[PDB]
Design a binder for this molecule. Sequence first.
Ligand SMILES: O=C1c2c(O)c(=O)ccn2N([C@H]2c3ccccc3SCc3c2ccc(F)c3F)[C@@H]2COCCN12
Ligand SMILES: [Mn+2]
Ligand SMILES: [Mn+2]
Ligand SMILES: [Mn+2]
Length: 184
Amino acid sequence: GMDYQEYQQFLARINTARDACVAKDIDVDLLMARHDYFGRELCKSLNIEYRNDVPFIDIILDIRPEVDPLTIDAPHITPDNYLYINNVLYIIDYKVSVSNESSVITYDKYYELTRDISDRLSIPIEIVIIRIDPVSRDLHINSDRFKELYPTIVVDINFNQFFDLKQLLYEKFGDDEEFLLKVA
Ligand SMILES: O=C1c2c(O)c(=O)ccn2N([C@H]2c3ccccc3SCc3c2ccc(F)c3F)[C@@H]2COCCN12
Ligand SMILES: [Mn+2]
Ligand SMILES: [Mn+2]
Ligand SMILES: [Mn+2]
């Protein structure tokens, strides 16, 4: 599961919170930690270095190190990770969601903004959204090309600890109207 030091920090934050807005920050942080926890376990399965929100220009400079960083027309996107293999750039983003809604938003955006730099570099750029459903624990990957690259991708984890911390948060703030309708 998640780190013991990380778990206790959430538990301390929940026990000291008295205010809805602080409680919603803990809620958004639980989602971020849950996402990052998935990323690290996924990256282990894919045998790639764990990364998060890496600037696209740093990706171009890694795969094509002769490119002038001062004068390259690159998109201003920060994908979770990438894999450059057989002159194909796979742009990876981690998702933890019961819905594909957030996947379609990220795909449509990353696809549209990588067409030009793909033409410029003469490198095909494949957008790979890797989503785990946190209930079913099923792994859904859009990219056929990415799935043909790898053996069947298995990320055998659960989010029971995240569910538990969220449950404690709602024990304490479940009757706070300001918390229940808090966005942050
Ligand atoms: O890196 C991400 C990102 C993802 O890669 C993602 O898959 C889902 C969501 N993301 N993001 C979320 C985020 C990420 C993970 C879990 C919950 C949240 S909830 C709002 C929020 C994010 C990041 C910072 C922040 F201050 C936020 F309030 C932002 C959005 O766009 C830029 C980069 N990014
Ligand atoms: Mn990200
Ligand atoms: Mn992500
Ligand atoms: Mn695997």
